[PDB]
Amino acid sequence: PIGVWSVFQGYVTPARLPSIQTLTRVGAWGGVVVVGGLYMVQPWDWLA
Amino acid sequence: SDAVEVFKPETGLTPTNRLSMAPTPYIKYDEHNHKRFPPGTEGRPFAYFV
Amino acid sequence: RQNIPLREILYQLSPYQQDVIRQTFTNAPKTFLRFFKEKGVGLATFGVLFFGIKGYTEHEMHQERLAERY
Amino acid sequence: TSLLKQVALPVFNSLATTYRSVVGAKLAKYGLRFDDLQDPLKDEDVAEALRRLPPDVVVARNCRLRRALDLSCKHEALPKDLLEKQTPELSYLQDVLNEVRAERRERAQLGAPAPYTRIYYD
Amino acid sequence: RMHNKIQLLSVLNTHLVAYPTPMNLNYSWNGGSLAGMMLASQMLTGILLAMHYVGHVDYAFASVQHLMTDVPSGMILRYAHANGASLFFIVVYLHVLRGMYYGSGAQP
Amino acid sequence: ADVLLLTWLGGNEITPITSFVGQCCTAYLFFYLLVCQPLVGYLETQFAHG
Amino acid sequence: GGGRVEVPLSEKLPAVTEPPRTSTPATKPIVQTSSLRSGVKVASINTVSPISSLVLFVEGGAAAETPATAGASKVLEVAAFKATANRSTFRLTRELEKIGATSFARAGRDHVAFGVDATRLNQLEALEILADAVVNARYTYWEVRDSLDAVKEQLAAQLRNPLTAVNEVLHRTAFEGGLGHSLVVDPSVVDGFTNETLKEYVHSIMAPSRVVLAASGVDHAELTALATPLLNLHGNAHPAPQSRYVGGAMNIIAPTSSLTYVGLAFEAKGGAGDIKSSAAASVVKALLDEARPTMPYQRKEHEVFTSVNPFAFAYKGTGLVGVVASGAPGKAGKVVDALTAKVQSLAKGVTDVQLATAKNMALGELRASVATAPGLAAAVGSSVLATGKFSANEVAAALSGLTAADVTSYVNAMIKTAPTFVTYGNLSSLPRVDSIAKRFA
Amino acid sequence: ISFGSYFGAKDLVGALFLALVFSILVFFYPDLLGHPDNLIPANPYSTPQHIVPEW
Amino acid sequence: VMRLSEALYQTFFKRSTVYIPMLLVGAYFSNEAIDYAVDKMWTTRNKGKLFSDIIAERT
Amino acid sequence: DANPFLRFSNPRPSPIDHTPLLSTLPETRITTLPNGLRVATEAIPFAETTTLGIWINSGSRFETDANNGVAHFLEHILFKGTKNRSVKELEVEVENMGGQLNAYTGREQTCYYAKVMGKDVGKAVNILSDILLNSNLDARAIDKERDVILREMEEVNKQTSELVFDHLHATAFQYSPLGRTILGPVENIKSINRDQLVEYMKTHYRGPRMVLAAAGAVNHDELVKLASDAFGSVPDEDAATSVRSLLVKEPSRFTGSYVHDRFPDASECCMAVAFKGASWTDPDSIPLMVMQTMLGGWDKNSTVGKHSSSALVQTVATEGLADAFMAFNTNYHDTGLFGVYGVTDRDRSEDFAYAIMSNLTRMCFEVRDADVARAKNQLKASLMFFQDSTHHVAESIGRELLVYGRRIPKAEMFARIDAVDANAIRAVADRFIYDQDMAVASAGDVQFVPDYNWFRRRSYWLRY
């Protein structure tokens, strides 16, 4: 009863969902893994 | 609540009881290993840069 | 360990005041029939689906080998 | 699709009654009720609703659960005189659990979480 | 208690001797212990096998043949290690199908 | 039955009928794992305790 | 960025005096009372305060308890303002906390009071919440079961003060009937309590002629017009066990009481119904105030006493005016002798300065009780429930128009009536009981 | 109930069934579940007709 | 006494998602500087003995 | 749905406009005497009682190390007899006006006030001026109070919360005047005399530092005349010895530090965590008031704590982390303190500490609008409740003239509260809380309280 049971019962409202700021702060981790992979591999001037 | 019924201290003018009733603002730390900065020194610490 | 509120009286008999393997020979056909009655529908469903689809596929494979046969 | 949904409501009632009849016939061989299938370890709403019951009801539920587990260990069923008295659709947990779920729905629309957590054994 | 004075005996007692288990478990709850027994058997047979196997091309096939015909009890060890993988997968697959049937992965 | 059929099909040769049957078996495997288990289970809970 | 204008500076042109000053009313507002068609009496008084207080007074308390429903008023103090037929507990708590309002449940010895205090802009919300939480309360099983623990520590903490225990035993000894029942009961009295017991008590105490709605700072016509559909009550008046004063004496055994407490009391004839007798009893209470803490850190020393605490309770038809004094365990007979000497010297006459001082003390207490809006609403509700009207102006006139001869006559009539005597503590020194109640005869 | 008394012999019964099947597979049908092509040494330039994994 | 600047704190230090890419570019440049210094010292000390010195000598 | 029982009210938090409440609120009149003393009244139209007193911009901060404790000893001595009235004469005259005298002595503020009826305004003015100006300060009464204070010091007779807050002020304001206790050390009490009391009153009780504030039933012109007759003889202040010059000369300093007061057989575990807050004149003090309302407070005699709007109250009440707690917002002339104080035991102290730190840091990132609207409504309602009691009206008049320099109108206060939104709360929490040093104080059974590095680590999040 964690997962689809939470949304079938009506426990996932517009509230209790993450805010736009929370999703942006989590979404800012996308650049970190890209920069880390480019740091690890170093394909310099490989962008087309 | 009262401290005599909750903390239940010993009676007397012991060194711990004097600071318990009236703590002093002139706290002395040990400075053999680290010397303190002047009190109230503001600003984000330089140790992050290091 | 948890505390379960429960009102009962439990009786247990010694293992050495009982027979060990002598009601198996009596309950054996009833156990067989009860097992097949309880799980009859699912075993039949599995067997029908598996063997029917396998037979249809094998028949069509033989037909496709015969269609290219000179 | 609402017109077809209105036709599907007696169909829903018919399938619900047929399912309940078949499962209750399966349930009454162990003496269990429908409300005895709900597990506090599986559902925290059931765990909270079971905490709201008077202790005699909890004692009766625990006795029925132990009787059914003993019957399952023995590979047996109830005797016929005892099997004729079973009423697997008698409700003791439904109103309490419904009110718990309504409370959790009302708290979630204002952002509040549930005031009870999952059960942890460690 | 003797097991209350050594911490190794306390853990072994708690998790292998006095562990409370439902009394109505049938024979489809024996998949896990069988899978553990097959894992231990595979580890033992393989560690014994690796004392006669050479992991190089132009020696691997000949080392397996020398294991089969010249090592005492080597044929038993090889055939046991080969068929034990099949039995390990049979047992683990039946274990997974048990968990699929009963909804064993649900909360908690 | 679907999983055992997929086990039988893997030892055969590539044939248009076996390709069609394997595609149908894979589609039903995904259908059971992702559609039957949540939705039919929710219907069962609504039937039993609804 | 937010506002950066510092609070020593005035805020800028976005700070307007757009609401004009409303003119003051010509006279001090008067109390206006009426009755609903259901029979519930509604009384209200207008104020210039920005706080509106709404309180609901129901006859009951310890006087309406039975041996089966023992300690139900104390449980009702905790269990009130929870889940009703229309709202859950969560919804009522959030609706109170949204407008910043506060709620209380307070049980007396002859009444229970429920109240909501809010600002003047949320008086309809406060009235609706109070009426819904009183009339349509559910008293569920699990909530009462979980509240019983907190009830037990609140009673155990309230019985730690010896004055509460002395007051309980004094009310037991002074009266037979309803007023002799115990309000602050032992914690083990409510050990077998359930929600059925509370529902039975509530069904006994609730009736349309035993419920008064009192409001402070609310227009009366609006309040009656909007409370008519909300306070339409039905029910039967459970019989009230009318109390009578008989007097007597008792004792209490306390194992680890570091002091020893002695209570002496008399009956105030007429109860809260007589204005003049209640005023004279309040003057006597002020005359018995030996050590009143009017200044910080002042050390008034008595030869024998450790604490003096008088009182004057005015119930319906009868009252209880008296004094409780502490003292050392070895000096309890001296405490009794000093108390008898004080009451006898009061009977010997009051001398002008003492009379003026006690009249000013009584007037100050009377006016400081109704200074705030919740205190004024509580005073209006209690006076209307006990009598049918609010007469604070008449009480002040009675306090001011009291002569020393009237007070001396009052104390002379008091000492002829049989008194009530209660002791407390690890009692290892006591004069015999026959000579205890002889010094006023 | 306790694991160590009641579910030790119950596991031993199933282990003995598994040992029977294992002994049959080892001693009587050792190459039944395999593939005969794996008894040919590997040739990167010649591929077998049918390339299938274990079951 | 010595103290990190507030404006430099609010840019490169307050969030980890900004701190980590700055850390990686600083790591890259530090590795480049250490490589340069070690290689320059080694080539200066062993001048005339390496294979590239013989090859450039034969041009 | 009930028709009459379900209108008008709903649990959805919406902003409320408190503008129509401003039409009938009374006005404050201020008159400055040539002495420099301000006389400020607020007449409530049908009041029967009056609170009036003298508020002084002085206290334990403006003492020295040699006379620390003189201002607290002054409220022991001042009511023990004047040069015109004895102890019994003062007692009889106060009893006949039906009121009580009272006194408070803070670190920066002192008040002596009377709660009387409206007919006894002039008598209360005369009595208050008589104790303030013509006190005996007898050496026998000083000796009679020194021994009582020394006994209660030897017994450690103190509230637990006051003990914790005194330790907190001592360790957060090291080597500044605000780190001293109001009570003072044992040696200053053991060597106190009449000369130090005279010198303290002569130095600090002057015209520009004193407000005579009266609320309730009082006329402004008559109080002006009575104050000019009575309090007209107070000395004026030198420009070189003003309050601002003393604030500049000895400024406040905040140091991030930790103290615990361990006892061997105690039961409770009281603890407070505070950050460096705002001064009284900082415009960020209104958002700190809103944030303190957002954190709230709770004690275990309430049973509706699980339905609270505040998430910290919800967490502590649901998990049972503390018996009681409260969030505080202390403001001084040039600094402040913001944080949470609570009472727990040794097995729940770390989880309570984690709940405090996690709820403080959460306000920098995620703040929803419903919580801010709820807290604004609760704070405005709390401000309206203080208007109901004339004692709080007089206290606010005295405090606002001492520390703001002026009487802030109610319309300006409502407008300044209504200008707070979620972005302002996030900005103020980012300024004061995030990655900053804090001060930690505990007393009692504190062996399981985490050390300073645990508290310092949890002032920031590594996941954003």
Ligand code: HEM
């Ligand atoms: C080498 C492999 C494995 C070993 C040694 C193992 C071991 C065990 C054991 C000893 C048990 C307890 C007894 C039993 O119920 O059989 C168990 C239960 C369980 N196992 Fe396995 N297991 C293995 C593989 C798996 C796999 C592959 C899955 C699922 C994909 C799985 C899922 C489960 C679940 C869900 C249970 C709980 C069943 C229940 O209590 O209803 N296990 N396992």
Ligand code: HEM
């Ligand atoms: C420590 C553990 C193990 C060791 C040292 C080991 C060792 C070996 C060695 C040396 C061989 C090559 C010799 C030969 O094939 O006869 C082999 C083959 C093989 N191993 Fe194991 N093994 C281990 C565990 C396992 C496990 C756990 C599995 C299955 C899940 C497994 C599956 C196989 C299979 C299928 C073969 C091919 C056998 C054949 O067809 O001849 N092994 N192993």
Ligand SMILES: COC1=C(OC)C(=O)C(C/C=C(\C)CC/C=C(\C)CC/C=C(\C)CC/C=C(/C)CCC=C(C)C)=C(C)C1=O
């Ligand atoms: C639902 O109820 C349960 C069951 O169902 C009745 C179970 O079955 C089990 C688990 C069963 C266990 C642990 C026994 C099965 C054996 C396993 C997993 C390992 C096999 C090992 C063997 C045979 C011996 C290995 C020997 C050695 C020397 C290796 C150790 C190495 C060193 C000491 C260096 C559990 C917990 C259970 O709760």
Ligand SMILES: [Zn+2]
């Ligand atoms: Zn002091």
